Structures are given as C-alpha cells and as structure tokens.
Design a binder for this molecule. Structure first.
Ligand SMILES: [Cl-]
Ligand SMILES: [Cl-]
Ligand SMILES: [Cl-]
Ligand SMILES: [Cl-]
Lengths: 598, 597
C-alpha cells in the first residue's frame, strides 16, 4: 500500500526499464500456451511507457478486446542481490500479470495507480525475461466502468447492427487507452532496514510553522530527519529520533498557489536514505469559503485528461511542462485529475510549479441508468464497484498524501447520485477518505447534471459541491438566453445552501477554424458566448468559489455521431493551440485574483 | 456623363445579364470575324462575372489575349420610337462591342462604365450582341503590366522559360477579367433627355442650399424637386434651365453610420430621373478631417472586389454581407483599392452611411521597385493620358455620392523618384478642377527608405501611408517594429497635416496559432496591430486607420502568396480571424468623431 516515489539516493539504485519492448496481441491461447516462459515469437515492437492503441495504423489493434503481452530481457548484475530488489509499475491499464521467467510474481487490478513486487533473488538467473500481460476489459466491476447490457447513449445508431467483433463498451466518454501507461523501473533498498513510508503534516497555529512526521520502517535501526531550504540550508534536524515527532520551521515560507515553496525533507534509517519535497500550507472549508493558508481561494482552471498523440494516456513529460506553462500563461491556478489519478511526475511538477489539484479517483461510469437501479444490491444487478472503490481511495491517498498541491479529493465523477441507494454506496467512501488522509482535506464528488438536482446525495456528503453543467450545450443549445435563465434558476438553489460550490465542468464542443458572427454551435465564437452567458450568472453568486472548464484540451473518445473525432470542448486543440475561447479566458482570468475574488 | 441606369416613367431598363456564349480567342477570332455569326464550338459563361475561376482550366484562368462573349438580342421594334442605349457597367480590361457584325464602340479601362446608342437601322428582327474582351496589360494600361521588369513578389530562385506568354502584373491582386459588371439596355425619349446631374450643397444655419446643374440634350423645360424619404416635397423649381439653386429648411444631414438620403426628382421634356442625394460637408482644416465640421477618425479597410467564384464580378449578396460585417465590427469607412467599385456598392454605401475613399485604377505606376517618369521617348511609363481619362470618368460617375469624401489619385506609385511631381501635379489639378465639391485629394504612399522625398508632401491634402512595420520589415521583431514605426511617423506628425494608414497588416492563415510571436499565425496578426496602435494612438495628426485587408483575396502565384493574399481580417468566405475580434473590440471604444480633438 505504501508507495513512496522511487528516487536515486545514497542507498537506492533506480534503473528505468522503459524503452522498446516486444509486444504481442493475445489470440485466446497466450496463457494456455505459456507465452511468458519464452521469448515472444512473431511479435511487434512497442514503446514503453505508452498506450498501445494509436502507435500503429491498425484498427484491430486500436479496438483490440482482451489481453496483450509485453516483454523485454532483464540482464542485471548479480551483485544487486546484496540489496532488496523491487520492480515498480507506475501504472498498467487496466489489469496486469507480471512474470519473471516462468514465474508469476504479482497481479494487479486498477489501471492508474502504482504497484510493486520484490524479485526473489533465487529467481534471478544469468539471463532473465520480464513479461507483462495487460488486460483492457471493463465491466460492472472495474473502475472505470464498462457497460454490459446498457446501451450506448453517446454512440447509438439510428438502426441496430451486429458488431463484427466483441468490443469493450465504455461507460465513460474518453477513449479506453490501455498498455504500460507509465514507467516500469527496478529499484533497490537496503535489505535489513529500510524506509517504507513517510507521512508529513503541517501545523500553523500560534504563528509557529511546524512539520509533523511519521516514518514507517522495516527492520531495526536509528531514525534521523532534517528539513532543508531550496539553497540547502538546514532549518531543522534531529537524530536518533522517534517514528513520530515534530520540527519547528523558523522563518517558514508557505507554499501558495502560483507561488510554490518546497522544502527538502531528508530522512535516514540505518543505511537507507530518502528525500521528500514538501510544501507547508493549510487547507480548510469554513462557511462558504475554501481557505488555503487561511485566505479565500477562487479556483480558475480545467478538468484535464492525460491525452497526447501518439502515446494516448502515456506519460509525456515535455507536454506536462507545456501544459503547466499554458496554464500560467492563461492565468489559471488549478485543475482536476479527471477521471483517474495522474502520473507522479505530473503531481510532483505541480508541487514545484504551484498548481492546485483536485485529486480524483478512477470512479467514472458508476451509473447504470443514464428495471435495475445503479445501487440496487449486487445480487439483483446493482453495480459491483464498491469494494474496488475503497481500494482505489486507499491507494490514491497513500500515494498523494504529502502533496501540497492536492487540496481536495474527488470520490467519483458523474455517478448516479440522485437515485436511491447512492448515499449508502458513498457514505463509507467519504468516511474512508476522511479517516485515511492525514491532512483531513475536503472531500467532494463531481455531480452529474440531473433534472432532480435537489436529490443529489452530494448535499449530504461533500465539503464543496462540484457541478458539471452544460447550460447552452446539452440543453438550451443555440438559445443562450434560455441557458442563462435555466442556469440562474438552478445555481440560485446551490447558492442558497451557503456552502462552497463550483463548476468542475462546463463547455461547448468547438472545432478550431469554424466561425460565425451569429450564435452557431461548434464555432469558436459560440464557445466564447457560452462562457460569457454562464459567467453572467456565476459572478453574481457569493458561494460560487471556482470555475474549471471542460476541457483543457481536445481529447480522444469512442466513436459516434456526436463526437467529431473525439471531444472538442478543449480551450486548446490536442496539439495545444489556443481557440478563441482560450484568449477569452486569458483576459478574464487575468482580472480575477487567486484570493479575495468573492 | 454616366448617370446610373434606373427604371423611370420615361426610361426602360432591360438587364442582359445571364448565361452567354463564350470563346477563347485562338489567334483567328478577328480575322475570321467571329462577331458576324453565332459563336461556334463555344462554352457558356455567367454574366456578370470574371471568367477566370468559373471552370477548372488553368489555360482559361491564365489566358493571354482576347475572349469573345455573345448573346442573342431580340427586342421589340416598338422600342425604336425611343433612344436605345447599351450600357456596359464594366468590361475588364478593354472591350470591342459589335451588334450584328457592326463595331459600335470600343473602350479602354476595365473598371468604369461606357455606353453606346444602337442606331435604329442596325436593329434587325433578330440580332447578335458580341463583346470582345482583352485582358492584356503593359506600360500603357491602368493597372500597369510589366514588360521587361522583373517579378519581385513571384520571383524564382532559378530563372525558367515560361511555357506560354502571360501577363506580368505590376500589382498584387489577380488579373480577373471578363464582363465584370452588368450589361443593360435602357431607353430615354429620343428628342429631349437628361444627360447629367450635378449637385453641391452649402449649409447656412440649419438651411441647406443645393446648387444644381442639369445637363440635357434637346430643347425642353427643366424642373427639379427634392423629397424626403417619406415623400414630402421640401424644395421645387420649375423652368430652371441648366444651372440654379434651391434651399431646404431644417435639412437632415447625411452622417457616417447615420445616413439620410433625399430623393432629387428631375423632369426634362418627357424625361424623368430620380437621384438619391445626401447632404454633408467635407473639409480639411489644419490636422483635422472634417465631415459636417466635426473631426472624423477613419476606422476601416482597404477592400477588394473579390469573391468566389465570380472573382471581380458584381456580387450583391456579398456586398450587403460585407457592409453588415463592417457595422458589426464598428468600422465607418473603406478605400476602393485599387479601382472604382460597382455603382451598386457605391449606392449601397450612400444608403448605409459608409464613408468611401474613391481610388483610380492607377496601381503599378512604378518601373523601379530607366526611370518611371522619364519621357515616354526614353522609356518612361505611358499612362498619364489614360490616367487623366480615368480621373475624369471616375469623378463624372461618382461626384454626387455623399459617401465619397476623398479621391485617391494612385496607389503605390514611384513618388520618391525624379519626375513624379511633374507626372502627378496635372492629375491633382484635374481632380480639383472637375470635382464640383472640391473634396480632398491624396495619393496612397508606398513604403520607401527616402520617405521625406515622397512628392505626396507637395500635392496631397491628407497623407495616406501604406506601412508594414512588423511584416515586410521587422518581421517577428515587434519591438524593433515599434521603434521604426515611431521614428518615421513622428516625421509625418511634425508636418501638421492629417495623415493616416491606408494599409497595414500581416499575412495570417486562419487556423495557425502560437502563443509566442510567429509570422502567419492569428496571434501574431493581433500583436502586429497592437504594436502599431501603440504608436499611432499617441500622434495627434494621425486621423485614421484602414487595415490591409478587409478579407483574403486572390493574387498571382509565388513563394510569398499562400494561395493569395492572407492579410484579411476575414477569410475569403467572410469568417472572422482573431484580429477581426480584436478590431471589433478596439473600434467599439473609438468614436467616429472627436477621438483626437
Ligand atoms: Cl471524459
Ligand atoms: Cl462533454
Ligand atoms: Cl492588391
Ligand atoms: Cl500586402
């Protein structure tokens, strides 16, 4: 469960295994024939990390159903066996079986969070094969959810037809990109005593900044901790200390949105050494305010995706940096990890750059009615995701708990939260997130637009109400006067509750290069008018504390009659070029402060 | 004299536009006298239209020489009781007109109207109307064609021999030719009719005095009446002869974006004619351009008559669309770059309140981009005689338009070289002599290193500059563009006279973008304009900004023309680029009057 990010230290090797791997589609016999026991025969080559779906020009590969096998040689020095040897998979989408030579080492469910396994030293021969089988299938038990008998609401035909081949049935908009999404690395620690986890929280009372620490270890040794400024000056340290304690940081500089400050927290245990960057800041909800460092924050930003061409969902470090640069150019301060945890490289970069993050689980598609009710008992056909949903919350918080940039947990996106049984499904998950987060950050779920919005169970659970609303697109299309009236009528209800609420999605599909002076859907001008109309309302509501558009950039989806080669609601194109509305938001957000707007 | 043809109680108006026969000359059309018979083995061509883009043939688009248009003309013999006139609104560039194999008239100049009576004796029971159209340009035509001069914009890295002889435009825009504007038959009474109407106005308190001169043929009595739009008579004089005056109490003035047109009704014998007319004053005083005694700020564009697929051909829906976009954007004006526009556009601008800088066909008068203005014997440009005719004909056609506030004598001539003043002084004198309203005159100044030697300084009432700081110089260095802009424009500002941009812009392909200054992107177009306005907004003699161009338009081919000229604020199908929205915002905040008071 504990998943410190692997780094190169005085006690820890870090060997990236990314590169060109062998790759073979399963044909139904890959496990029966034990393909993992030998070199893959008649295979292709595929880059790792990457989604596999768009690398070639093959629809059969893009739309593959089931398993694929990745493989590479693993020839390492025998002297590594004096250390503990760990194989870390930052993400394999969706499920994985990992073999070293003929031996199954581990299995994992969940396509967007890391997992690891020690390699038993007896298994390491002079020459080794590493094989990773990757399953892309989704159903009522996976997060994200795949449909079983439910029909395609975004990709329905006018006339029914029989598909040529069995395929996944996503219950979510974004394309089902699968493969070895994030890096695979070998790392080492000392065998006999090592650090397994580090937990840090901040206390800011009485004009004193302190870091509280909890160091989890294996074995028996002495612990030491020191806190260092950017320039390397030690500002607090203690040796031969307890597993838990606190350190006062004199002259403490707080981490602020768009003004980051990261200390370096250096820990030793026996011969083991680990350094964690850490920003000191407070988060609290009070009344209708979202307080960061006791100041009333206004979210400006986006729902994003991890989506670039041609790697799909795969880690793209140059584009992560481009994206943050574009956010700062635009005057944004924040985004949400729609609809799955993002790479650690992104999260660590957001800590370094001062970008605020709403950290969301993989729980999209928990909705069987967009007659069996979504949250009926499993034995009568209800959704089967709650058990895995708990595991995802535990794993997400364990991975991201120390990030200053994370200010809120989003428990799910667009679940059936207006139906009976939703509160019962979600109450244990909100309780779990609050129990497990050492910083006790706000929790929310992101609310689907619904006719009976007053029955949304978010009202009984969340610290901030996070709304996805499309007044002027999925309703009132090309009637922005009606959109404004409908928007005002519902958002005045949310404002009357006196709690913080915000948009986490709002937007209009826009094909770059389509134009009209006169309100016309899909044009760049309509996208601007759509947003102007919505802001006419939100700017008058004192409890509305944030605007995150759908979406930062155009991204790939499943095929159908309302998806013009993917989702076109980006302010930017897929290659990160600004539409008219991106210039509109640069002007608007330049005039809105991060603090004190409302 | 060229009154716009209208339907009246004394005048039929019969449009001959439609589908005509069309044949490329193969070098034998005059020898074999194709005009004497139905054209054989011919194509079909819409009239009015340029012919170049209607088909899919490069040999047609890039044709050199003559083409023949033809239609049947079967008219009632009872029209022979009337005077019968064939009006060609525009045939580009030169025309020979035949009825039944008799040559009736010829015309040089592709953008102004001409007409001929049809002699009664020539009209048979069945008739053929044939129009031969010449597209060739050289040192004697306006616009100018190159002869031995090099292709600057469309030059190759390595010389080559062209497959076929072709025109060598000394101008950017594509050489669209054909029967550009409508052909109509009209009638007037035979014995006595109105040939021309001239109106000037004077504002004494709230009373307008309209001075008229009605030119006629034959002996009859002349009468004039001025009516409000709703039809109330506000002044009337009978048996007035040729010249006279009359007064309108509490006259409604024509204003930019607030038009008002009276109807001036004239009778002469049995002839009847109605002219729309707006009352307004124009004067340059100090560094001010005064419309109705108020300091105007021009906001607008150089345009082209350019749409797909008609090329230069009259497109009345697009004319109305274009004016609507101008009002949407907050513009108040444009220049007819680089030729007189259709009467239909000019009359629509009167109706809609759009101010016009009316420009001649004189683009390309420049042999050194042998001196341009050397004597013709020594190889100088051979255009001055036709240039005089164009000025005469343009002012004769457009003199009564309230929307026309200034004449542009030429665009981007070689005005910094020796002999330029000697070439242009007679033309400026001519324009001032012939315009009854004595409106301001200018020439449109090419960008040049020796700008203080531009003879515009000695001739023009307003200095009209084409400047590309940040495009043709300082490209992708807008800080240097701002410094170079300020250095030159402070010189012009020091002369104390009104000056303006008539061209400034940056090629921009819709859909190309970059946050970081990059030529041809939509963002760079905006930054280019922001940089220039940083300078112009601080200069008190700078009284107007007209971008190049309203919309992308077709040009000759070459390495710097990305399928034509891309400096439009709008695409060729009139869609707004980022900079079109920039100017809508900017012009929304700048008044038409009193911006620089
Ligand atoms: Cl999505
Ligand atoms: Cl959407
Ligand atoms: Cl041009
Ligand atoms: Cl140009």
């Amino acid at each position: 469960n504990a998943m410190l990010y692997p780094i190169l230290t005085q006690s820890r090797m870090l060997i990236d295994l990314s590169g060109t791997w062998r790759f073979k589609l399963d044909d139904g016999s890959g496990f029966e024939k034990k393909w993992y026991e030998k070199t893959l025969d008649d295979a292709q080559l595929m880059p790792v990390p990457s989604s596999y779906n768009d690398i070639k020009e093959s629809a059969d590969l893009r739309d593959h159903y089931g398993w694929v096998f990745y493989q590479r040689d693993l020839n390492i020095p025998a002297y590594l066996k004096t250390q503990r040897i760990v194989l870390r998979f930052a993400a394999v989408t969706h499920s994985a079986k990992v073999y070293v030579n003929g031996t199954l080492l581990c299995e994992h469910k969940g396509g967007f969070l890391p997992f690891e396994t020690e390699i038993p030293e007896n298994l390491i021969r002079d020459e080794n094969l590493l094989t990773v089988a990757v399953d892309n299938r989704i159903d009522h038990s996976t997060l994200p959810v795949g449909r079983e008998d439910e029909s395609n609401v975004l990709g329905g035909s006018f006339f029914p037809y029989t598909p040529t081949k069995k395929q996944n049935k996503p219950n979510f908009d974004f394309f089902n990109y699968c493969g070895i999404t994030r890096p695979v690395k070998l790392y080492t620690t000392p065998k006999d005593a090592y650090i397994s986890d580090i937990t840090l929280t901040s206390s800011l009372e009485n004009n004193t900044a302190r870091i509280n620490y909890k160091i989890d270890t294996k074995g028996s040794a002495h612990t030491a901790i020191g806190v260092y400024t950017k320039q390397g000056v030690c500002v607090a340290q203690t040796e031969n200390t307890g597993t838990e304690g606190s350190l006062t940081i004199e002259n403490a500089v707080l981490w602020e949105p768009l003004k980051p400050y990261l200390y370096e927290v250096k820990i030793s245990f026996g011969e083991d050494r680990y350094t964690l960057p850490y920003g000191i800041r407070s988060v609290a909800v009070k009344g209708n305010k979202f307080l960061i460092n006791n100041k009333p924050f206004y979210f400006k930003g986006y729902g994003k995706h991890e989506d670039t061409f041609p790697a799909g969902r795969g880690l793209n470090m140059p584009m992560n940096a481009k994206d943050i640069s574009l956010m700062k150019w635009q005057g944004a301060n924040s985004f949400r990890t729609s609809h799955y945890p993002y790479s650690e490289e992104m999260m660590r970069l957001c800590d370094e750059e001062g970008i605020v993050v709403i950290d969301e689980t993989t729980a999209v598609g928990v909705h069987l009615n967009f007659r069996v009710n979504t949250f009926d008992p499993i034995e009568q056909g209800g959704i089967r995701t709650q058990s895995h949903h708990k595991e995802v919350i535990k794993d997400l918080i364990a991975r991201d708990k120390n990030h200053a940039c994370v200010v809120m947990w989003s428990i799910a996106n667009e679940a059936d939260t207006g139906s009976k049984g939703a509160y019962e499904y979600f109450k244990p998950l909100f309780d779990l997130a609050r129990e497990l987060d050492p910083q006790k950050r706000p929790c929310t779920l992101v609310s689907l637009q619904m006719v009976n919005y007053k029955e949304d169970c978010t009202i009984k659970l969340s610290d901030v109400f996070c709304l996805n609303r499309y007044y002027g697109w999925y309703t009132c299309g090309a009637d922005l006067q009606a959109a404004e009236k409908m928007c005002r009528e519902e958002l005045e209800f949310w404002n009357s509750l006196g709690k913080p609420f915000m948009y986490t999605e709002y937007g209009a599909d826009t094909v770059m290069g389509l134009h009209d002076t006169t309100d016309s859907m899909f044009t760049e001008e309509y996208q601007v008018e759509y947003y102007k109309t919505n802001h006419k309302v939100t700017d008058t509501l004192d409890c509305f504390i944030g605007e995150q558009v759908w979406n930062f950039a155009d991204f790939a989806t499943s095929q159908g009659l309302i998806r013009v080669q993917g989702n076109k609601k980006g302010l930017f194109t897929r290659d990160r070029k600004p539409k008219l509305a991106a210039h509109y938001f640069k002007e608007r957000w330049s005039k809105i402060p991060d603090f004190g707007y409302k």
